[PDB]
Design a protein around this nucleic acid. Structure first.
Length: 314
DNA sequence: GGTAGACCTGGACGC
DNA sequence: GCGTCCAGTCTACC
């Protein structure tokens, strides 16, 4: 009853709603699609994870996004806490308006969008986003998901326990910059990226001015922001774009990877022009990003997520 | 300036 | 069953 992960049906009084039609958000298409790696569908149609330093479980009906929080006598999420959810899913951005625009300038998008509605971008914390995607390079979402979980378990603050799952907040720069972190991360199966994590945590704390340097990129320009991030070990052009798009409010950033290359070739018959190489490379990857920006506009990164998510389902 | 080529770790084939 | 293919970043040369 009062134990384990909650379900909308079991603990009715322990759920608050936020007006949100499935056309504006589809949890099943957003939470497991490689944006954030910290959400799990513990119960069918119920996703649990850490949001703003607290554990939440989210579920939705046709017109509502039901939220419950685990902090203190159990109670309903307050209006202020629900506002944390709204900000995380950037609910002030009307997805139906973006879908209309992209579909208007791109016939292929319109065709796909019809079947994959509700794919929006999460507004993530800079640190979590930075290190989660450092773990993403040359890897698959399933494996990345485990790496991130073990990393948080070992270096992140212990939050709450539901059933046999103990939730952890994301590790601080200081913790990731700690001694022997690399070796520990290797035993945790992060592979060569273990070095990237330690190396990048130390570089930020003792070379770039710390957390302030990162959070500052949020007001800087996409070009500026993307440039500064590539300085970090393990952070190439794709990772930097992921961070710009998902944590630094740069909606035009388009992370170029294997999926986008297949998509470009299969669905748009795209081929590099300003570059001589016919395959992925720093120049062609860059050109591909500009191509998608010219095609979709200021929110090209968001449109990317729609096709990426839909390309995942296959 | 622009490349082949290792670099962790499995799940997924193919034979 | 076992050796590949596959889900970016770094770097030693050309």
């Amino acid at each position: 009853g009062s134990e384990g992960h909650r379900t909308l049906a079991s603990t009715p009084a322990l759920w608050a709603s936020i007006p949100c039609p499935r056309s504006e958000l589809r949890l099943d298409l957003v939470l497991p699609s490689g944006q954030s790696f910290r959400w799990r569908e513990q119960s069918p149609a119920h996703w649990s994870g850490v949001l703003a330093d607290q554990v939440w479980t989210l579920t939705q009906t046709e017109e509502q996004l039901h939220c419950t929080v685990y902090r203190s006598q159990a109670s309903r999420p307050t209006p202020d806490e629900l506002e944390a959810v709204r900000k995380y899913f950037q609910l002030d951005v009307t997805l139906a308006q973006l879908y209309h625009h992209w579909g208007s300038v791109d016939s292929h998008f319109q065709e796909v969008a019809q079947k994959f509605q509700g794919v929006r971008l999460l507004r993530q914390d800079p640190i979590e986003c930075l290190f989660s995607f450092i773990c993403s390079s040359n890897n698959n979402i399933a494996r990345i998901t485990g790496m991130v979980e073990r990393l948080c378990q070992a270096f992140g603050p212990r939050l709450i326990q539901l059933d046999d799952v103990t939730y952890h907040g994301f590790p601080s720069l200081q913790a990731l910059a700690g001694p022997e972190v690399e070796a520990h991360l290797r035993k945790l199966g992060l592979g060569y990226r273990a070095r990237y994590v330690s190396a990048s945590a130390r570089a930020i704390l003792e070379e770039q001015g710390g957390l302030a340097w990162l959070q500052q990129l949020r007001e800087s320009s996409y070009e500026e922001a993307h440039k500064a991030l590539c300085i970090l070990p393990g952070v190439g052009t794709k990772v930097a774009d992921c961070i710009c798009l998902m944590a630094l409010d740069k909606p035009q950033a388009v992370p170029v990877d294997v999926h986008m290359w297949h998509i470009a070739q299969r669905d748009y018959s795209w081929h590099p022009t300003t570059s001589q190489a016919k395959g992925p490379s720093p120049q062609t990857n860059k050109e591909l990003g500009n191509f998608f920006r010219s095609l979709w506009g200021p929110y090209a990164g968001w449109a990317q997520a729609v096709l990426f998510s839909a390309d995942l389902r296959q």
